[PDB]
């Protein structure tokens, strides 16, 4: 497939009540291409006043007796399935927009990101008419049952590293349960989300069920967090903004909260593993999506006996990583999202040598035709150094040493984060022991970054509150109501 | 059954690591009998230092390879089952302790509160080895499964209206899932929980699994809520404090939060209801436990056809209610918990009269000692009155009239709260339409109020976050870890 | 829509391994149009040799590493959803094939039968990748999980009264779980099932996953029931043949068996019901599908106060029911399936008049072409009559009379059958008491033949084994495998 | 613990309606000690007349409105909890009965058999009030929920190899779901079951809920399997008799059938496994309970490289196995159950010698009295040999050679049986490939004969129909009733 050539950006306005509207203040804000630096377009900037309109529209579409409430649960799924069909029809345009806006290689935006979006809508389309309550054999002459009702108006805030994918991961389970949504994409990458607005309207979704409001964090996002008319907020982003999100809920209307926060997730290679396979997977586990992942390997604990040739094979392939333009079919890695992320990544690369790390290859040195950075491999890293404790979100791979299994479990777990973790080995005892000992939400064995629409995903500890994906992602978007009926006499 | 004659309070110390300790500061605080105002005993006052010692003991009991972590899940249930046997053996002592400390009539504490405690422990004893994960058929060559593991150290804060029952509601699901507990009972009523510590040690729970720290809210409670070594907080209490808990959790260590906050629960009576039965059930809905239930049917809506007779019957029933000493088997209504509650109820009663409501009976304090209040009935109450919008945790009944089902549905839902609701009718269509339309976590039909170990209990809107009781109470105390293994072929 | 004129029957051969084949013997059998009595076409007759070829093809399509076994579960679902798209495409063709072969009014076949077929495939298309096993916290140092695997080759035998819907209800959950199918449609109505094989081929199911073999009962069916290479048989039909089915399973393979057998289902109407609504619901409860529903409410119990009035409206509606050609848009009732069924009905109608029952209308045939029977209403029926104890698969409505609730529960439950029951009342107490006291797998309250793609069926006592539809229909088509892995220590 | 001194057999009568009855014919049958051939006692022999009295008592106890049907689900669990306490109190007496009557070593009965009995009753005690139905979001204005009710009278027939444990596995899930039971223990071993009748009465079960009828297969057993008033039969577990059970059920009243039939279970030892550990677990997998487990165990496939060393170590262990009196604390292996089994094993041992297998050890009977057989090991066994097929319910080990995993999977699966499989390896890929490929209801990895109350147990193919143990064991003893209520509006 090919990136669609002269791609007009047709949708740049605010999406409220299935209508395109200008910002209340009149302001707009620029969207940028990270592969050059040229401004792509300008998008209407939502602020608090725009959020108040989106919430009023979402509340009306959720009122009792509305089109969205009375709709058969199975027809909720048919709409989600039809959204997947429209995305598949415009898969090239959407993937082109994702390479243009986020700087991802087009061929993996087409075959990875867009596939996960299509599969997510298809997967949750089947769940809509399969969300069950229960009947309970209760004491006394009573008949007790539960209903899994939708919570209501849901505010959703998503980052920039997977704009279209995170958009699907948020609205698909929310709409599957019958909620209405006010979602605010990252200010850096709002375009694919806004294009989804036209697909949502084309699919047949009732007005006000999904409202897309592009804007900045402290303005439009903080308006969502403290809004008294939003029943539930789903936030995916940094830990510190997550603490603000949690505080805003308790301060305002005690809205229900889930936070996906990521962390410094370990990657454990053992001597038993196939080195050719472990090198490539731990490479993709940290370098994929220009390293801007929280599942990112970052730390790579390698056993004593294989540490040397592991680094040898890492830098070997890390030097063939074809950096270049996203629209080029040869490009493996595109540029970072913006300058500030392109900057504070290089502070930490300079911090690596400033604390004593054998910088093998890497260090940054690409023609500034964009926001590109040279693939970097550090070694002789220790738990003390700053590059081991804070996340990088860049093509920086840090390799460490370990001897005992018991020492690598403590070293991997000694972290207030804990989103994911990986183990590479063929011993079944050590694979089961390490996986069961990890304080992380997802543990991969002999693989990395293997996400699926069917499997729940979330973080332990401070990285954080809640679960997404799979069936368990639906519990986040449902409210349990118990009904107890007095009956003349109970039997059975 | 009779009250324990010369009830000595044997356990007045802080319970950490299965050992009775004095407070780090040496302070004690008094405990009073609300029926006479006399001081019953003094109890060691836990503060921040004692909380810190409890958390480190609870954390040590939860570390890998400990007795509580290595113990069979079925053996966790054996311990909860043994605890229920000990509560059953000392049922009269604990009921007398609840009556003397809390003012509940002894027969009600024996047959209602103590029965709920025993059935709660026996219920969750059976859940321990039945908490199941799932295996998921993901795309590709993968074997994906999930584990449901304990959260960690759980901080628990409970109020004074059902001291022993709230104690069991909190620790039973937490222990069932394998966590450890630091629990702070209300400063008004710490005696039942301290006696449970002795039963906890007698049953054979490992040291540090349950730690009980009697103390005050701003000192002991706030230290629990802001502790960075506590993974999860479960709070039951006022909405104003509940806001401070969710806030302090976000700015500290992003601990998971459970809130049970209650509300202003409506009770709808249609003309096609067993009038004599509805009068009695709505009478118990307000007056049970001295009106100090969050499920209190504060606003009783009556259809206009039966309004005058329902008022006349409710007033006669309220004039017959026996207020007196809790130890007297004739007593139906004990005192309020303290002078703070007593004063806030008397002021609200004054507000109802000043705003035009018809004081049908009562409205004044009873006697000179204790905190007894006359059973009070207000008629002609409208939605805008203060007594109709504010929670009166006291023996005050409020009767409002309505005309149509759609009118009473909007009025009953018009509330920041949504904990509980009830409808009394013999029409199946009215019963199902109203129960489906209520914005409340529990809806009762022709009853008030059937709670049970099997039925989930929570609230909509600002009445709480999450659920207690039943299977769904377990989900608050487990965290999901997803494990994905790369496999050679996969055969579906 | 309109019936496709001069419909050409194109598929008349045996469908094995996605190939149309002739009989191994060469024999063929005729298919008739029961509205005009003459021959539609000729269809290949499958026998033991042909079933053997089907089983061998189904066994190969299920072997390890095959396309069907290696297929992602979500891709099994998209195949089922493509099949629903195709059925929707040829909807008017299949409805015309169902009116022509089965005598159903075309609009009823279009808007009811095929609406259920499409929704059934779409519903089970969503279940394919959501069949979850479980992980269990067993005692000892063990990790235990379960896999829900397909059983294997499933033999399926269906009757003639809902040929396309029966076909869908059988293969949809079977394919959803990953099984392969050898299905034998009723010899009276094999056409629409054979057309499905063309849609199966077009949708892209692997060869041999579905094998459709038209033939006769004691030949093709008995070969299926006794075949040693078939893992599970699913039979829907008469009770007597069902006894032969389970005997063959025990005599041969110990294959898993589920049966869907007769009904003689009671319909209970109380005086407080809306008589206009109940008269029509209980009228469709008997007369729908020419009275040839196992769920027929052939025992209408009416409260004494409304009996003679209920009889009058039931009589007036019966004489108004338009009987005629199914292709005619004004036709409500078509003909019976064949001559054998036509004779048994009249021999039971004459059984009622030879005994005490009062014949209010109809009672005889209509002409010569087709097997049309007048809409018939019997009054004053008692439990002793043959007409109240034997299943009448015709348009014969019997109206009994009762006085008390305890009486009608006793009379309704007095039956070796127990597939279905209905209650019409606005009182919640007698609705819940009667519905709980019924000995039937489905109880309808203030409705009747309201089946859905969700919600199980049948199926109590001698009326069935196991359940179809809903999630529980999947339980019949999976086998549990427990895997226990020894681990070093185990915690949590 | 030591065997009960002398031990009197006090309960030798038929247990019906909580009363001890004589046989209707007055006949008794002897019970023997298999270690000495001497007669222990005589027991009333139940026949068709006694079964009819038991079914009548079981039907009345199941009557609507009876104590057993009105009892809270939680109180059904309390009774199971009390029965476990009584079994624990009399653990030594029941262990001595199992040893004296069944031939098991006393310490094995005490620590293995009765531990399983106690844990089984305790496990299902917790399930009673946790059997949940579901509420279903169906299309249209409908409210649909399911109730899981007891089936009714459950006939149960169990074997002699694990008398008390089979008794608990049968009645615990049946009583947990609220059924009533008519159970026939094996004629060889009725003593433990009859003693349980005394504890059942002492625990406080209502009369007629459990009825224990000692007798023979063709008399008492065949009357149960063909009884018209029995709703469900659960059988265990000879395959030949299992065919008669499923056939008689279809011929009688189409009662529901669960079968737990035999097996020739493989044990696959790979080269990369702990050899000393695998030799011992494969030894116990064959020789435990005198080789009288259907979870044997017989066919041990060993990889070629370790074949001869595995064989030598297995012979060394077999020559050391201590055979002698069950009461002697040093005994590892008691006698066979009776002369019929004794002769059956010696016959098959001759078949192995005549067919060319290498008799490395054993092959003869031990002593002149009892039914002791030397621990016997066959090497150089091949698939075609008679001993490689055909269940040897005795202390006979057979060791087969293999290379390549694909070969051993095809050979281990080459069986009409499919109850159990095991694999010993440290490679996670081999362990997961084999366990997923095995056609068996239970696969063990690096262990054998684990088994717990929490994990379901059953057979593939002709090894059984359905599942016992775990949550899935409850699915066999419940009937799903769907209730659908038409509602006015319907919202999410
Ligand atoms: N499937 C399992 O879980 C399991 C467990 C243990 C043993 N077994 C099987 O038990 C068998 C050993 O005992 P067995 O050889 O005496 O088999 P068996 O079937 O003859 O004996 C078991 C029971 O079957 C009953 N029985 C015998 N004939 C009957 C008939 N015509 N009608 C009704 N009931 C009849 C008897 O009451 C007896 O108690 C082994 O073959 C083994 O496979 C199976
Ligand atoms: C063929 S069977 O289905 O009749 C059967 C019966 C018993 C066992 C068995 N065998 N062992 C065993 C123990 C030690 C050694 C050794 N060394 C070997 C075997 C333990 C068990 C067992 O069931 N435990 C158990 C525990 C708790 C609950 C419960 F319900 C059952 C295996 C198969």
Q: Residue D296's domain is classified under what CATH number?
A: 3.40.309.10
Q: At what angle do helices B114-125 and B73-89 cross, to 10 degrees?
A: 160
Tokens of C464: 């069935």
End-to-end CA distance of chain D: 61
Query: How buried is residue A379: exposed, middle or buried, by Cβ count under 10 Å (0-12/13-18/19+)?
Result: buried
- C-alpha separations of B384 from A232, B390, B404, C475 in Å: 28, 10, 19, 54
Q: Is A239 annotated as a binding residue?
A: yes
DSSP label at B129? G
DSSP label at B419? S
What is the spatial distance between Cα B36 and Cα B48, in angstroms, rounded to a whole number? 32
Q: What is the resolution of this structure in A?
A: 2.3
State how beta strands A420-424 and A442-445 pair: parallel
Tokens of C82: 């493509």
Phi, psi of C318 (to 5 degrees): -65, -50
Among candidate residues B29, B23, B28, B30, the one with its CA nearest the CA of residue B47 = B23
Contact criterion met (CB below 8 Å) for B227 and B147: no
**Domain membership flag for residue A8:** no
What is the spatial distance between Cα A127 and Cα A122, in angstroms, rounded to a whole number? 9
What is the spatial distance between Cα A82 and Cα D185, in angstroms, rounded to a whole number? 59
Chain D residue closest in CA terms to C410 = D64
Tokens of C418: 């127990």
Protein residue with its CA nearest to atom 29 in ligand 1: D217
Q: Which residues contact C403 (CB under 8 A, 6 or more apart)?
A: C303, C304
Tell me: do A190 and A289 sit in the same domain. Answer: no
Phi, psi of C256 (to 5 degrees): -70, 140
Tokens of B304: 């206009």
End-to-end CA distance of chain A: 62
Tokens of A485: 């009926």
Tokens of A416: 């207030």
DSSP label at B236? E
Put simply, the answer to whether D137 touches A146 (Cβ < 8 Å) is no
Q: Is the minimum CB–CB distance between D382 and chain A shorter than 8 Å?
A: no
Q: Which residues contact A319 (CB under 8 A, 6 or more apart)?
A: A361, A375
Q: Count Cα atoms within 13 angstroms, Cβ side, for A91.
A: 19
Q: Count Cα atoms within 13 angstroms, Cβ side, for C209.
A: 25
Sign of CA dihedral B431, B434, B437, B442: negative
**Ligand 1 binding pocket includes D261 (Cβ within 6 Å):** yes
Please, which chains are in contact with D (at least 3 CB pairs closer than 8 A)? A, B, C
Among candidate residues A477, A293, A473, A472, the one with its CA nearest the CA of residue A396 = A293
Q: Is the peptide bond before A342 cis (omega within 30 degrees of 0)?
A: no
**Domain membership flag for residue C9:** no
Q: Is the minimum CB–CB distance between C67 and chain B shorter than 8 Å?
A: no
Mutate to test the pocket of ligand 1, among D217, D233, D235, D476 (most ligand atoms within 8 A of CB): D217
What is the spatial distance between Cα D468 and Cα D120, in angstroms, rounded to a whole number? 11
Tell me: do C249 and C314 sit in the same domain. Answer: no
Q: Which residue among D135, D145, D427 sits closest to A428, beta carbon to beta carbon?
A: D427
Q: Is B160 annotated as a binding residue?
A: yes
Q: Dump strand ranges (E) for B334-466.
A: 358-361, 365-366, 372-373, 376-379, 396-402, 417-418, 420-424, 442-445, 457-458, 460-461, 464-465
3-state secondary structure at position C417: coil
Q: Which residue among C147, C429, C492 sits closest to B135, beta carbon to beta carbon?
A: C147
3-state secondary structure chain A: CCCCCCCCCCCCCEEECCEEECCCCCCEEEEECCCCCCEEEEEECECHHHHHHHHHHHHHHHCCCCHHHHCCHHHHHHHHHHHHHHHHHCHHHHHHHHHHHHCCCHHHHHHHHHHHHHHHHHHHHCCHHHCCECEECCCCCEEEEEEEEECCEEEEECCCCCHHHHHHHHHHHHHHCCCEEEEECCCCCCHHHHHHHHHHHHHCCCCCCEEECCECHHHHHHHHHCCCCCCEEEEECCHHHHHHHHHHHHHCCCCEEEEECCCCCCEEECCCCCHHHHHHHHHHHHHHHHHCCCCCCCEEEEEHHHHHHHHHHHHHHHCCCCECCCCCCCCCECCCCCHHHHHHHHHHHHHHHHCCCCCCCCCCCCCCCCCCCCCEEECCCCCCCHHHCCCCCCCEEEEEEECCHHHHHHHHHCCCCCCEEEEECCEHHHHHHHHHHCCCCEEEECCCCCCCCCCCEECCHHHCCCEECCCHHHHCCEEEEEEEEECCCCCC
**Domain membership flag for residue C123:** yes
State how beta strands B232-236 and B256-260 pair: parallel
Q: Is the minimum CB–CB distance between C17 and chain B shorter than 8 Å?
A: no
**Ligand 1 binding pocket includes D186 (Cβ within 6 Å):** yes
Q: Is D240 annotated as a binding residue?
A: yes
Q: Is A240 annotated as a binding residue?
A: yes
Q: Which residues contact D88 (CB under 8 A, 6 or more apart)?
A: D118
3-state secondary structure at position C86: helix
Tokens of A3: 């990136």
Contact criterion met (CB below 8 Å) for A64 and B434: no
State how beta strands A180-184 and A210-212 pair: parallel
Protein residue with its CA nearest to atom 22 in ligand 2: D451
What is the maximal distance between C-alpha atoms in chain B?
82
Contact criterion met (CB below 8 Å) for C60 and C68: no
Q: Compute chain D's Rg from CA coordinates.
A: 24
Mutate to test the pocket of ligand 1, among D29, D187, D237 (most ligand atoms within 8 A of CB): D237
Q: Is A342 annotated as a binding residue?
A: yes
Tokens of A403: 């001897």
Tell me: do C166 and C240 sit in the same domain. Answer: yes
Tell me: do D197 and D124 sit in the same domain. Answer: yes
Bridge partner list, B108: none
**Ligand 2 binding pocket includes D66 (Cβ within 6 Å):** no
What is the spatial distance between Cα A467 and Cα A175, in angstroms, rounded to a whole number? 17
Has D294 been annotated as catalytic?
yes
**Ligand 1 binding pocket includes D294 (Cβ within 6 Å):** yes
What is the spatial distance between Cα A348 and Cα C402, in angstroms, rounded to a whole number? 86
Chain B residue closest in CA terms to D429 = B487
| Chain D residues within 8 A of A68 when measuring between CB atoms | 492
What is the spatial distance between Cα C430 and Cα C424, in angstroms, rounded to a whole number? 10
Put simply, the answer to whether B123 touches D432 (Cβ < 8 Å) is no
- C-alpha separations of A167 from A28, A189, A326 in Å: 22, 11, 21
Q: Which residues contact B32 (CB under 8 A, 6 or more apart)?
A: B38, B39, B40, B338
Tell me: do B258 and B309 sit in the same domain. Answer: no
Query: How buried is residue B125: exposed, middle or buried, by Cβ count under 10 Å (0-12/13-18/19+)?
Result: buried
The single residue listed with the structure tokens 């095809």 is D410
Contact criterion met (CB below 8 Å) for B480 and B146: yes
User: What is the DSSP annotation of B86-110?
Assistant: HHHHTHHHHHHHHHHHH---HHHII
What is the spatial distance between Cα C216 and Cα C38, in angstroms, rounded to a whole number? 19
Q: Is the minimum CB–CB distance between C427 and chain B shorter than 8 Å?
A: yes
Among candidate residues D317, D300, D455, the one with its CA nearest the CA of residue D379 = D300
Q: C-alpha angle A384/A389/A390, rounded to 5°?
A: 145
State the ligand closest to the CA atom of D123. 2
Among candidate residues C490, C475, C488, C489, the one with its CA nearest the CA of residue C132 = C475
**Ligand 2 binding pocket includes D275 (Cβ within 6 Å):** no
Q: Is the peptide bond before B485 cis (omega within 30 degrees of 0)?
A: no
State the ligand closest to the CA atom of C484. 2
| Chain A residues within 8 A of C437 when measuring between CB atoms | 491
Tell me: do D204 and D307 sit in the same domain. Answer: no
Contact criterion met (CB below 8 Å) for B116 and B197: no
Tell me: do D271 and D250 sit in the same domain. Answer: no
**Domain membership flag for residue A401:** yes
Determination method here? X-ray
**Ligand 1 binding pocket includes D213 (Cβ within 6 Å):** no
Put simply, the answer to whether B150 touches C492 (Cβ < 8 Å) is yes
With the CA atoms of C60, C61, C67 and C73 taken in that order, what torsion angle do they form, in degrees rounded to the nearest 10?
Answer: -140
Domain count, chain A: 2
3-state secondary structure at position B379: strand
Query: How buried is residue A272: exposed, middle or buried, by Cβ count under 10 Å (0-12/13-18/19+)?
Result: middle
**Domain membership flag for residue A485:** no
Tokens of D279: 């030799």
Among candidate residues B345, B379, B348, the one with its CA nearest the CA of residue B365 = B345
Tell me: do C144 and C177 sit in the same domain. Answer: yes
Q: At what angle do helices A163-176 and A91-102 cross, to 10 degrees?
A: 120
State the ligand closest to the CA atom of D295. 2
What is the spatial distance between Cα C263 and Cα C238, in angstroms, rounded to a whole number? 10
Q: Which residues contact D340 (CB under 8 A, 6 or more apart)?
A: none
What is the spatial distance between Cα D418 and Cα C361, in angstroms, rounded to a whole number? 60
Among candidate residues D39, D292, D219, D57, the one with its CA nearest the CA of residue D153 = D57
Put simply, the answer to whether B460 touches A437 (Cβ < 8 Å) is no
Q: At what angle do helices D239-251 and C239-251 cross, to 10 degrees?
A: 170
Q: Chains A, D: CB contacts under 8 A, how many?
A: 92
| Chain D residues within 8 A of A70 when measuring between CB atoms | 489-491
What is the maximal distance between C-alpha atoms in chain C?
81
- C-alpha separations of A316 from A309, A362, D72 in Å: 10, 12, 70
Exposure pattern of B284-295 as b/e (b: 16+ CB <10 Å)?
bbbbbbbbbbbb
Contact criterion met (CB below 8 Å) for A335 and A372: yes
| Chain C residues within 8 A of D259 when measuring between CB atoms | 254
- C-alpha separations of A240 from A169, B226, B232, C285, D416 in Å: 22, 16, 19, 63, 62
Q: How far is CA D267 from the centre of its chain?
A: 20
Q: How far is CA C74 from the centre of its chain?
A: 27
DSSP label at D355? T
Q: C-alpha angle C351/C353/C358, rounded to 5°?
A: 135
Q: Which residues contact B19 (CB under 8 A, 6 or more apart)?
A: B207
What is the spatial distance between Cα B426 and Cα B446, in angstroms, rounded to a whole number? 8
What is the spatial distance between Cα B320 and Cα D475, in angstroms, rounded to a whole number? 52
**Domain membership flag for residue A421:** yes
What separation in Å is there between the alpha carbon of D165 and the centre of ligand 2?
Answer: 9
Residue B52 is part of a domain; what is its CATH number? 3.40.605.10
**Ligand 1 binding pocket includes D341 (Cβ within 6 Å):** no
What is the spatial distance between Cα C345 and Cα B150, in angstroms, rounded to a whole number? 65
**Ligand 2 binding pocket includes D455 (Cβ within 6 Å):** no
Put simply, the answer to whether C432 touches A485 (Cβ < 8 Å) is yes
Neighbours of C407 (CB within 10 A): 11
Q: Which residue among C135, C427, C431 sits closest to B147, beta carbon to beta carbon?
A: C135
- C-alpha separations of C297 from A238, A414, C315, C397, C450 in Å: 62, 68, 16, 8, 13
Q: How far is CA B417 from the centre of its chain?
A: 16
**Domain membership flag for residue C424:** yes
Tokens of D86: 């009584």
Among candidate residues C455, C430, C458, the one with its CA nearest the CA of residue C445 = C430
Q: Is the minimum CB–CB distance between C231 and chain D shorter than 8 Å?
A: yes
Q: Which residue among B134, B425, B489 sits closest to C134, beta carbon to beta carbon?
A: B134
What separation in Å is there between the alpha carbon of D242 and the centre of ligand 1?
Answer: 8
Among candidate residues D234, D110, D112, the one with its CA nearest the CA of residue D167 = D234
Tokens of D227: 């009884």
Tell me: do D173 and D44 sit in the same domain. Answer: yes
State the ligand closest to the CA atom of B72. 2
What is the spatial distance between Cα B15 and Cα B5, in angstroms, rounded to a whole number? 26
| H or E element, residue C168 | helix C163-176
What is the spatial distance between Cα B94 and Cα B191, in angstroms, rounded to a whole number? 9
Contact criterion met (CB below 8 Å) for B173 and B476: yes
3-state secondary structure at position D89: helix
DSSP label at C357? P
Bridge partner list, A421: A443
Contact criterion met (CB below 8 Å) for B109 and B4: no
What's the residue count for chain D? 492
Contact criterion met (CB below 8 Å) for B278 and B448: no
Protein residue with its CA nearest to atom 16 in ligand 1: D159
Ramachandran bin of C385, using left for φ above 0, alpha for ψ from -120 to 50, beta for the remaining angles: beta
What is the spatial distance between Cα D401 and Cα D271, in angstroms, rounded to a whole number? 11
DSSP label at C337? S
3-state secondary structure at position B442: strand
Which one from A45, A260, A360, A476 is the annotated catalytic residue?
Answer: A260
**Ligand 1 binding pocket includes D241 (Cβ within 6 Å):** yes
| Chain D residues within 8 A of C446 when measuring between CB atoms | 485-486
Which one from D176, D177, D294, D361 is the annotated catalytic residue?
Answer: D294
Q: C-alpha angle B388/B362/B303, rounded to 5°?
A: 45
End-to-end CA distance of chain C: 62
Q: How far is CA B10 from the centre of its chain?
A: 25
Tell me: do A242 and A378 sit in the same domain. Answer: no
What is the spatial distance between Cα C449 and Cα C447, in angstroms, rounded to a whole number? 7
State how beta strands B299-303 and B266-269 pair: parallel
What is the spatial distance between Cα C222 and Cα C241, in angstroms, rounded to a whole number? 10
Tell me: do B26 and B75 sit in the same domain. Answer: yes
What is the spatial distance between Cα D55 and Cα D122, in angstroms, rounded to a whole number? 27
- C-alpha separations of B172 from B441, B468, C71, D206 in Å: 21, 11, 44, 31
Q: Which residues contact D310 (CB under 8 A, 6 or more apart)?
A: D269, D275, D278, D279, D302, D399
Tokens of A467: 């679960």
Bridge partner list, C235: C157, C259
Q: Is the peptide bond before C111 cis (omega within 30 degrees of 0)?
A: no
Q: Long-range contacts of range C218-224, CB-CB < 8 Å, 24 or more positions apart?
A: C219/C45, C219/C46, C219/C47, C219/C48, C220/C45, C220/C46, C220/C47, C220/C48, C220/C50, C220/C51, C220/C184, C221/C157, C221/C184, C222/C248, C223/C47, C223/C48, C223/C51, C223/C52, C224/C51, C224/C155, C224/C157, C224/C182, C224/C184
- C-alpha separations of C94 from C102, C199, C292 in Å: 12, 11, 20
Protein residue with its CA nearest to atom 11 in ligand 2: D449
3-state secondary structure at position D476: helix
Bridge partner list, C378: C359, C398
Put simply, the answer to whether B433 touches D487 (Cβ < 8 Å) is yes
**Domain membership flag for residue A490:** no
**Ligand 1 binding pocket includes D237 (Cβ within 6 Å):** yes
Tell me: do D271 and D256 sit in the same domain. Answer: no
Q: Compute chain A's Rg from CA coordinates.
A: 24
Instruction: Find the domain containing B279 and state its range.
Output: 266-465
């Amino acid at each position: 497939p090919s990136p669609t050539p002269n791609l007009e950006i047709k949708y740049t306005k605010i999406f409220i009540n299935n209508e395109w509207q200008n910002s209340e203040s009149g302001r707009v804000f620029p969207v940028y291409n990270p592969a050059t630096g040229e401004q792509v377009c300008e998008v209407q900037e939502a602020d608090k006043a725009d959020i108040d309109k989106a919430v009023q529209a979402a509340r009306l579409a959720f009122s009792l007796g509305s089109v969205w409430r009375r709709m058969d649960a199975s027809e909720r799924g048919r709409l989600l399935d039809k959204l997947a069909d429209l995305v598949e029809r415009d898969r090239a345009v959407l993937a082109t927009m994702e390479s243009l806006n986020g700087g991802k290689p087009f061929l993996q935006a087409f075959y990875v990101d867009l596939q996960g979006v299509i599969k997510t809508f298809r997967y949750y389309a089947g769940w809509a008419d399969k969300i069950h309550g229960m009947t309970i054999p209760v004491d006394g002459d009573y008949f007790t049952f539960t209903r899994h009702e939708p919570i209501g108006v849901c505010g959703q805030i998503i980052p920039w590293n997977f704009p279209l994918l995170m958009f699907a991961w948020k609205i698909a389970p929310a709409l599957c349960c019958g909620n209405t949504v006010v979602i605010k994409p990252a200010e850096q990458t709002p375009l694919s989300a806004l294009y989804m607005g036209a697909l949502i309207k084309e699919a047949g979704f009732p007005p006000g069920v999904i409202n897309i409001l592009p804007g900045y964090g402290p303005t439009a996002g903080a308006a969502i967090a403290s809004h008294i008319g939003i029943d539930k907020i789903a936030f995916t982003g940094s830990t510190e903004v997550g603490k603000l999100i949690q505080e805003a809920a308790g301060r305002s209307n005690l809205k229900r909260v889930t936070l996906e926060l990521g962390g410094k997730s370990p990657n454990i290679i053992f001597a038993d593993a196939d080195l050719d396979y472990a090198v490539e997977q731990a490479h993709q586990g940290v370098f994929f999506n220009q390293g801007q992942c929280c599942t990112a390997g970052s730390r790579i604990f390698v056993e004593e006996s294989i540490y040397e040739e592991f680094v040898r094979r890492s830098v070997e392939r890390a030097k063939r990583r074809v950096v270049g333009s996203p629209f080029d079919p040869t490009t493996e890695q595109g540029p970072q999202i913006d300058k500030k992320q392109y900057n504070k990544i290089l502070e930490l690369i300079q911090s690596g040598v400033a604390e004593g790390a054998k910088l093998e290859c890497g260090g940054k040195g690409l023609g500034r035709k964009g926001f590109f950075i040279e693939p970097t491999v550090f070694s002789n890293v220790t738990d003390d150094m700053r590059i081991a404790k804070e996340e990088i979100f860049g093509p920086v791979q840090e390799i460490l040493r370990f001897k005992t299994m018991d020492e690598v479990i403590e070293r991997a777990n000694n972290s207030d984060f804990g989103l994911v973790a990986a183990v590479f080995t063929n011993d079944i005892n050590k694979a089961l022991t390490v996986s069961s000992a990890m304080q992380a939400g997802t543990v991969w064995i002999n693989c990395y970054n293997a996400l699926n629409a069917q499997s729940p995903f979330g973080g332990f500890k401070m990285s954080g509150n809640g679960r997404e994906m799979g069936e368990f992602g639906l519990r986040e978007y449902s409210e349990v109501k118990t009904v107890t009926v007095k009956i003349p006499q109970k039997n059975s």
